[PDB]
């Protein structure tokens, strides 16, 4: 699809068996999801943005279905205000910015 | 152009006659620029990001070139880690997300 940007580019994702709404975010290096359980090992990390840093749990090799497209990569979990699909997974679904 | 997302989508902007680097950010509602001087009056605004909120100075109808494309709109100034071009100006330059 071609998504215009008059409004937030929100899509449905499936992660860890759960459907969630997430923002397609070219400004995010990493994919950041609100608190949930995910399987496997994790390690703590800090990520920073406007307003400062939050502590997250980093899970590797997580599969997410993004608007019907599967992708695998690292997902960090923590007290983000919005679920964010960052560049590490946007690349995997072939997303580009065009103008 | 068509911008892939393997690297941060950084572009050159021109604002007040000065060139700056900025991130094309579909996850940003608003365009947020590091401290600089802009003409006219400003209004207060709070923006909420990943680590909480910040106060910014909102300037309207600012002339800004983005990757060679002319925009005139709202720019807010404050302590952002990087200059971000948000959807308010991405729409003016005709940007879409495509996959
Ligand atoms: C500021 C950017 C360099 C990075 N951010 C992604 C960005 O798109 C966030 C993504 C975002 C979106 C909503 C809430 C929090 C974070 N947007 C944002 O802060 O936008 C602010 C300016 O416009 C306003 O509209 C949206 C919030 C305001 S970030 O959320 O801080 C971020 C930082 C590091 C990682 N790894 C992943 C995400
Ligand atoms: Cl990854
Ligand atoms: Cl590619
Ligand atoms: Na893992």
Curated annotation (Swiss-Prot), chains A, B:
Which cysteines does the record link by disulfide bonds?
A: none
- Location of the region described as Dimerization of protease in the Swiss-Prot/TrEMBL record: 1-5, 49-55, 88-99
What does the record give as the active site?
Answer: 25
Domain of life where this protein originates: Viruses
Q: Domain (Peptidase A2): give its ranges.
A: 20-89
| Signal sequence range | none
User: Subunit notes for this chain?
Assistant: Homodimer, whose active site consists of two apposed aspartic acid residues.
What is the name of this protein? Protease
Q: Which gene encodes it?
A: gag-pol
